[model samples]
Target: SVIKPDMKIKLRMEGAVNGHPFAIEGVGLGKPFEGKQSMDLKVKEGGPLPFAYDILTTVFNRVFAKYPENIVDYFKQSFPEGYSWERSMNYEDGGICNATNDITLDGDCYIYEIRFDGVNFPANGPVMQKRTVKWEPSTENLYVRDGVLKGDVNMALSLEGGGHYRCDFKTTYKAKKVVQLPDYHFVDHHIEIKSHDKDYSNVNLHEHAEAHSE
Candidate 1:
């Protein structure tokens, strides 16, 4: 029996929170903290199997809408106005893969895909800024369970001004079904406004160490 590979591999995505100094500031901790996290995702390749990412998107949407029990403790503690989320798919980033799950022959060595979700709040100020969150990397952990291969994802958000933070989480998937999990990781995931402005400059964004769970 010969096994094939997947289409997901090598991903890259980038976005940020903009508009209104107050909202942007608040989102990153300044004057605004208006209440929103602009984010984006890009899966280099979908992979050898037929993965729709419905589980991933649905789980994420649910969470953004208020799945986490500690929404107030987790995000509300800092952002008072509240939060929201959104997502999109495109023809960029090497696109999706159409291989088999044999792991025997020569095929793509990695899996890829992306999602854009935001933690948003109402317009406390005149307008609100968008905090763009993007995930596009492969961590070494979780191979297979029951009958599927899983992957863990950890994010390092570098704001446009300066500050940054970490938003670590996990991504699980089965050979035939989509998968999504809550309470993955978003600790110390805040932003701090920067003094100077460069283009997506390292401004009011928190920073997190790379994922080293091996």
Candidate 2:
């Protein structure tokens, strides 16, 4: 029998790597699954939706355009109250740094876990963090630098623990081949990495549709 979407299972982790896994098997706080719905947007007569296809297209495009705005609002809402933090030693640009999470998910169970590395931290201070390594074959084949066989990764002096002095740091990077030349011009160009235009219409639609449906 296929595993229902809401079922839970346990996880066992084993690796010859530096970080041992901490298995947390309860429900994650991320958005829960919402079942698919019919795309027909025409509401009752004189209702809040459109009927014509052209008008619906325009409306859908406008609705789609708000996706990025939603992300901006999400960030704005998240960065207040107990959810926000700066570096242990503040910098002029507000103590911002890039962070990458190395995540590993056991497919047999719906468990998630991570270990922290490569994130900039205040020298000799507390920092909250986690990382994981994931491999999705239908998507990019993600893995670590091979043949290193359990080497200590270079780490910055970070905060004491993850709960205190924390910021939600997320990063997206294309894996480079060994000895690859860096794209300096493109690197400095200010482009929205995960914008609605890039995500909604193209990659996220096409690739994900193919992955699960095909």
Local accuracy by lDDT, each model: 0.25, 0.19
Question: Against the correct fold, how does model 1 do in TM-score?
Answer: 0.26
Compared with the true structure, the alpha-carbon lDDT of candidate 1 equals 0.25
Best by lDDT: 1
Return the lDDT, model 1, position 185: 33
- What does candidate 1's lDDT look like per residue over 1-214, in tens digits? 1112111122222222121111111111111122222222222332211212221221211111122343222222212222222222211221221111111112322212223332232333111222323333223243444443343445443333544434444544333223332233332222222232332322233222222121
Clashes of each: 47, 14
List the candidates' TM-scores in order.
Answer: 0.26, 0.21
Q: What does candidate 2's lDDT look like per residue over 1-214, in tens digits?
A: 2223332322222211112212111222111122111121212222221111110110010001112211222111211110111112221213333222222224322332322112233333232112211111111111123311111111122222322232222223222112221111110101111212211221111001010101
Minimal lDDT window, size 10, model 1: 22-31
In model 1, how large is the Cα lDDT of residue 8? 15
- Residue runs of model 1 more than 4 Å from their true location after superposition: 1-128, 131-140, 177-214
CA RMSD of all predictions = 18.0, 20.8
